[model samples]
Target chain A: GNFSACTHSFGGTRDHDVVEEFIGNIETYKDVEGISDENALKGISLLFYGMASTWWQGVRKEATTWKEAIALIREHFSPTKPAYQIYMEFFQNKQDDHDPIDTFVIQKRALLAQLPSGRHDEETELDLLFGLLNIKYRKHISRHSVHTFKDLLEQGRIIEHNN
Target chain B: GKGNFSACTHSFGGTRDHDVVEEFIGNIETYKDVEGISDENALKGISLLFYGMASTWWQGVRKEATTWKEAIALIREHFSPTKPAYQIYMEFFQNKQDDHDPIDTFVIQKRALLAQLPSGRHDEETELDLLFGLLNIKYRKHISRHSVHTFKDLLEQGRIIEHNN
Candidate 1:
């Protein structure tokens, strides 16, 4: 499932419920009571981050067919795991506090345990996934411990764009 | 950090029955006899081997653990239908056998005790060591692989962009 553009339109600070306010209608996107894009995106980002690293990734790599690959990818994106908001909550707090890399790394590694597995076929799709993650980590760039877009470009981290 | 024994447990077809075996063995620690053996290298070795098998079972069940409670839950989630709480019974039997089981109770209890070690984040190696200890060997490899993949995927896509902030 793709993240709705509607969620992106709002700035990233509005308070909302973790599941219902944000993930309840991501693609179909129902405007629930007292919800905002910031809430939904944060919740959804955590969702994407979790299974995208753990169960889904493993399932994807173990896939035998293309249909399986697509399903794997879809499942990878699905916010099925418990504590989806916990990641975002932790992420937001850490970024807000400008915590040390050690602390940040701890949280990141803990959450990384849950992302989906398996190699994706299309290079473009991979980029979209990367882009999504960049936004997730955007707040931490100024910290000495964080990675920057320019750092990535200079280090030749990106395949699509050289600049 | 403990070895990659746990990860191997998950990757294999080891079943929850194996955990029951450990629990059974663990229960025997409740008595002085089991306590006498705990510090012995041989007993620790047995426990380590048991942990290895238990870890393999974790892989079989595909148990996911993020928190302390979750981690313990993963180990205890399933029991062999033949003996749901084998460790308890096993220890009781050991107790009958000259209090050997009750002596092992502390050893079994030790399994559930939360790690209270302080952090040494000053050294990346130490942190890694702690992580390995917390996750065991199998998870360390998987986590590293996952990070490397994420790094490459991000780079390949040229999705590296300046923060909107």
Candidate 2:
């Protein structure tokens, strides 16, 4: 449905999560406003700038309707990448020294979600969590059995808060 | 700076020209955090910010840049080319009140255009231009009868009040 204000406009260089959030909000409002695909595309168009604007100026002439325009935009912005590389990055990612625990966890989860989904035993989940943490967190976390993902996050937050 | 912003995958549409510059700077900022992000990567990131004619410009100058800062300085200078004063003046005069267009909107548009031109502090010159630029032909005779010289006086005594007539 239509929302309050557009605080989520993309600024060309935001991470994927930020771009998705902005697109999702616009899609949500489409139904409430009874907005047609063309209008929705135009509404989204008002927020674009830079290379995107120049790109649109050229591509818009070919797009007969909103669906064509939206597809053109999505294809340009969100191209698929090799899953193996993404997985490797996820495993290699470490909590930055200055990063808040909650922010770290969120970023970790987003990376994890992009990978193949499957069941993980408690120990496996705990290992993954520990692997992603900084070396400083090891001392505080190793003392506990932290089997559950939720508990792992809680301990991380505690450590961060204390630090 | 570290991430891939190649034209191969990422669409550069929906961003402002100024914002594109900011994003290029932000990429450099992130590059500072990474260990081995090269000067070439910074050049590449900056080059990806332009599209169309601007992209052509970047391609021509890409090799001339030896450092990221140099590339940035070059692009910044390129983007801020001066617009002719006469162009601004023409645009100001071109904005006339339509029959359906509100007088307030016309006045606001006029004032905005005026603000962009070199300061027209010369009251006599400004008054003559403002009087000639009035869209409502019906008010022209009434506007000319007034001895007021300032743009503000022209608006107060002639344009806004006599707009409907």
Candidate 3:
């Protein structure tokens, strides 16, 4: 299926988005095109360049099978952080002085994605997110009754403009 | 005082990555032992070898560092901050010998990663045992047939079989 056409470059930055997209593309190429592991491995080799190319060369021998190779690739480029580490990041992310209420809200959601999905209920989610706001905003927003994460954001935004 | 680094041909600029920055420092270390070079002077000598933004970047920042030891410390942190040893171990573990490379080459490459760890840089036996598991299955399967004692024995035994086969 000429799997190379569907692949993208990996220039060795390990930037979260770049590595994630690459894994997605590789999976898409394999599943959608109905490509064989033997063929996909050959095609995958073309995507890595520079340090990644060198990295690929050094590790490829052990990862001989397509399944082995894909798992190995993900290990180096997309190593998952522990749950505690993600939790640390969630608590440490304070709403910056210039941050819009919407901006801060979505980023916290992104952090939640890193943790186990649906581990927290909607009420628990809003409580955690709402706690991240600044003193002025949070105190003012707390005066109103907020039911969901969206309601909190709307209240935060209204408070954002007034003060 | 300005000094020379005749053997060093490496350079860096705005357009570079961690690899280029790491290469520049690694190249500098190889020549840090030139007879006249002292700790302070080694950094001074290395500075003369930079190009483009590297050259200009040094001019503004040179006053910030007092010695080669301090300079390299700051430079590595700025350019390629070494990760914690745990993270490096993770990388080293994943960097198994690829199917195509010779055992001889893999050992050296593996050693390079092993040396990056803050600890255990000089333990030959520990390195030997750790590396045995990471070797190409072909080499391990062959080497495992006989009891090997040291890293040297492992290398010699593996290479004998691999090179001959």
Candidate 4:
């Protein structure tokens, strides 16, 4: 009776930071499933448990639309990343000894997504990312290689697989 | 050493026994294989994942479990000790598919309960027959004419039937 139509839930873990992905998934789910504003409220109402539910209970009045509820959630978990910090992230991270190349690209892709549209084309973005890889990519994959962001991702994997 | 598991993400707190079995345990096993995390380190890493009531329970039992498998068994034994053979059979056979319930989800849950029942080492026909009896009329009417041999085969049939209606 009192659950959100959206099945996405928040349980309020302090360091578990996938809030952006969570919000993106919720948006896509609402659009694809044709869930209504009222239905979504109920879905979210039942989704939270543990500490997040405690915070949900703390709110005197809930938001009308699911979007606003998500906005409140964004402020709590991830907060909004500023443009300045977003730029810093693009240069900071590198593929290290451990993680798979896919892991490196996934985190990079998220950082790049934060920037304004048209800031970089696919080639330019791939160029930017090529420098961020460890010795593996920069050594084997040529600088100024004409490949899309996707091409570089696969190439990095093939290098590891072959060698 | 760096790891793939994020802390507190997969904690099981006594409730949602199905989730502990289906979600947390499966994922932890995966992290061990995919992330190159050994069992002893995984046993060490349990603190990162466990909290709430589970954290408290782990605190008391930590010394008793040396390996990750042993730790997992402890959690399973304490949280979801095996149901009696009579009860497991009752749950597996007596389980009725709800009208609104999806058949695929029911199959997995029922299958988990079936695994717990005393091993008669039942044959495919016998096993499928027991399972097929729990289906709602909708599924029975759709596929009753066709003879399915095993749970997986029936599940494939159910998936097809679900999309049609």
Q: Deviation in angstroms for B129 in model 2? A: 3.9
What tens-digit string does per-residue lDDT give for candidate 3 at A77-139?
A: 765664434544666656888888888888888887876574556654565465566676766
Ranking by TM-score: 3, 2, 4, 1
Interface Cα RMSD in Å, per prediction: 20.1, 29.8, 17.0, 26.8
Q: Which residue pairs show collisions in model 3?
A: A61-B98, A61-B99
Q: Estimate the TM-score of every prediction.
A: 0.17, 0.27, 0.27, 0.26
Pairwise lDDT winner, candidates 1 and 3: 3
Better of 2 and 3 by DockQ: 3
Native contact fraction per model: 0.00, 0.00, 0.00, 0.00
Model 1 per-residue lDDT tens digits across residues A28-69: 452533435445333333334443435544453455543443
Q: Please give the distance, in angstroms, between residue A121's alpha carbon in candidate 2 and its true position after superposition.
A: 72
Off by over 4 Å in 2: A1-163, B1-14, B26-57, B60-90, B95-105, B112-140, B144-151, B159-165
Expressed as tens digits, the lDDT of each residue in B1-165 for candidate 2 is: 235344223223223366665675566556443535566665666655556776776676676577877776665545544343334444544445676654456667777756654453324443344434454655455554223445565567654655555
Q: How far is each candidate from the true structure, as Cα RMSD in Å?
A: 25.4, 25.7, 24.3, 23.2
Look at candidate 1 and tell me the lDDT of residue A105: 44
For model 2, what is the alpha-carbon lDDT of residue B108?
71
Query: What would the per-residue lDDT of candidate 3 be over residues B18-55, giving only the tens digit for each residue?
Result: 77777777777766654456776677676667777767
DockQ of each: 0.01, 0.01, 0.01, 0.01
